[PDB]
């Protein structure tokens, strides 16, 4: 609107900005060396 | 090979084929005029039960009879207090027409009135015209006289 009282306009431009920032999921990456076997099949079983 | 419906294989190929199918279906349900017969009649109110005389064809080429219509008015020509009537009884034939809208509220009072319902162009509320067709003998003398 841009002609109202200062604090009224400060109340606006909030809430509206909340409509326009929505958080997407989190991505996590790792790198590792697996020494034994049972860990490998456990991971694959969890994967399936 | 009875096909369960009046559907054709080339339909659903294009839009125009479907459009023609729906056009034919919408036209068929539109009712105007067919011959009919009298089942019951009372001379005192000009209302007669009517049974149409043309059946319905099926995918097996069978014949399905139509439905009787009750309280159908009979036309009695006349105006200015001078009319003509024929002593109709059971089994007489003729023609039946279909009114545009619902006429029951009009038939109660014979004055201006709303349509009762939204049903249009059906034989439920029509008008019966008596006829004899070719069943008569004409004498040789009045071959050219009314």
């Amino acid at each position: 609107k841009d002609q109202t009282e200062a604090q009224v306009y400060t109340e606006a431009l909030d809430i509206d900005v909340k409509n326009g920032k929505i958080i997407q999921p989190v991505r996590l990456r790792i790198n590792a060396i697996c020494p034994d076997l049972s860990t490998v099949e456990s991971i694959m079983n969890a994967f399936n | 090979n009875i096909s369960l419906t009046s559907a054709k294989a080339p339909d659903r190929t294009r839009l125009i084929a479907a459009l023609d199918a729906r056009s034919r279906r919408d036209a068929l349900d539109f009712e105007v005029m067919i011959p009919a017969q009298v089942v019951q009649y009372d001379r005192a109110e000009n209302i007669a039960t009517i049974q149409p005389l043309i059946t319905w064809v099926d995918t097996e080429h069978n014949a399905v009879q139509r439905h009787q219509l009750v309280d159908i008015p009979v036309i009695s020509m006349g105006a200015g207090g001078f009319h003509i009537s024929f002593p109709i009884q059971q089994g007489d034939i003729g023609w039946i027409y279909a009114a545009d809208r619902d006429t029951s509220q009009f038939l109660e009072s014979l004055s201006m009135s709303k349509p009762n319902t939204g049903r249009i162009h059906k034989f439920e509320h029509g008008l019966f015209i008596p006829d004899v067709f070719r069943r008569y003998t004409i004498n040789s003398e009045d071959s050219a006289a009314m």
């Binding site: - | 089942v39 019951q40 009787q68 059971q90």
Partner: protein, 52 residues
Amino acid sequence: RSQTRISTGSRVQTPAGAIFTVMSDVTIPAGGVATIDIKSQEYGNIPLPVGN
């Protein structure tokens, strides 16, 4: 003659009858047929000796 009586043919007695017909019937050449009656309400009411 040859009338097709229908269900729910409502017959009203003078003391608040409001009575349906229970099953369909078709009129015979005699001119008199039998039809059944059920009351539109769930209280105790009585029918008059004559048709109303």
